[PDB]
Design a binder for this molecule. Structure first.
Ligand SMILES: N[C@@H](Cn1oc(=O)[nH]c1=O)C(=O)O
Lengths: 180, 67, 86, 49
């Protein structure tokens, strides 16, 4: 079966993380802004601009690593500004690694082509047209890579031999690449 | 007599090699990498939400040194 | 009364946001910050996408076949063929 | 010794490849004494087994 690529979903960019992580990111983004809101909007507080419109915006700019307008000029504000920075340092960096991890695995995926690869790939089953010249060619086989197939094709379950070629094309079409 | 000519050794090559193998055939291309779990990155949240509480305690001790 | 977002500044806020750079200009409206928000999340994916794939080129090499199976030999007119006389 | 004869009458293909190689490797991979046999490990720094 010619392996045409499966088109991903439009929401497949976030596949390096789990979607259980992303929901916990948003719950963390909400709570960090509100904790900074209570720290900033304190009862003796001078000039503390971090409202609910600013602390929602400051944490977003800190999470996207694009800087900020202003920084918290208070020690408890610097703590929550500190731990959110070490939060968003890891989550962005962990996303970069697993997205590299998907792509490094994907290029190691090699198509089985030289028939030695077919002699080693037990995941894809392979059969022939029985009662022809192919099945007899593997019967009196003198090459070990051919010998492994005739060891397998006699011993595979169920019958990998197919009576007609039209069904022999059909077991390729039905398995969608699981069969050779 | 069977060992000096290797009939028994071929029978050793017979019975343990014909049963199907579990070697590099499933270590070779039966792996795809997963997404990250939450548990891989869980401890960052404990430092985060723990940092949320530790910010709240220093804000309360400023209330003493302000008063 | 200070609309610092000109047509010449809106390029400049958007550019350093694409180049991971910190901008002095920040949007100061809910209708403005939604623009800068999703533009920030855009470039976060893309630069990580560029870093990820370029590693995959350098980690796994794959040297291409110029010619194959004699149909490519007919279309290619850069190569010269060779045969043995007698 | 007994190692070289054990690969001589070998009946396992992974052993057969070695006795195909050890007779055919250049120069002599066979070493007369064990002290020099340790020495060709030490000299090659991991190029020799
Ligand atoms: N035409 C072939 C039969 N055959 O066709 C195949 O595709 N395989 C095979 O054995 C014959 O004369 O025996």
């Amino acid at each position: 079966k010619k392996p045409q690529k499966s088109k991903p979903g439009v929401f497949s960019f976030l596949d390096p993380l789990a979607y259980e992580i992303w929901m916990c990111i948003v719950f963390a983004y909400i709570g960090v802004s509100v904790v900074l809101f209570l720290v900033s909007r304190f009862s003796p507080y001078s000039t503390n601009e971090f409202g609910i419109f600013n602390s929602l915006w400051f944490s977003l700019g800190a999470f996207m690593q694009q800087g900020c307008d202003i920084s918290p000029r208070s020690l408890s504000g610097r703590i929550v500004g500190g731990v959110w920075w070490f939060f968003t340092l890891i989550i962005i960096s962990s996303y970069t690694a697993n997205l590299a991890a998907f792509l490094t695995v994907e290029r190691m995926v090699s198509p089985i082509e030289s028939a030695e690869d077919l002699s080693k790939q037990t995941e894809i089953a392979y059969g022939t047209l029985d009662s022809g010249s192919t099945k007899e060619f593997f019967r009196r086989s003198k090459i070990a890579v051919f010998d492994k197939m005739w060891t397998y094709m006699r011993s595979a379950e169920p019958s990998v031999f197919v009576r007609t070629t039209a069904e022999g094309v059909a077991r390729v079409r039905k398995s969608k690449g699981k069969y050779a | 007599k069977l060992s000096e000519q290797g009939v028994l050794d071929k029978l050793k090559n017979k019975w343990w090699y014909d049963k199907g193998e579990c070697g590099a055939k499933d270590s070779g291309s039966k792996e795809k990498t997963s997404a990250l779990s939450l548990s891989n990155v869980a401890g960052v949240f404990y430092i985060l939400v723990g940092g949320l509480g530790l910010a709240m305690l220093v804000a309360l001790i400023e209330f003493c040194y302000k008063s």
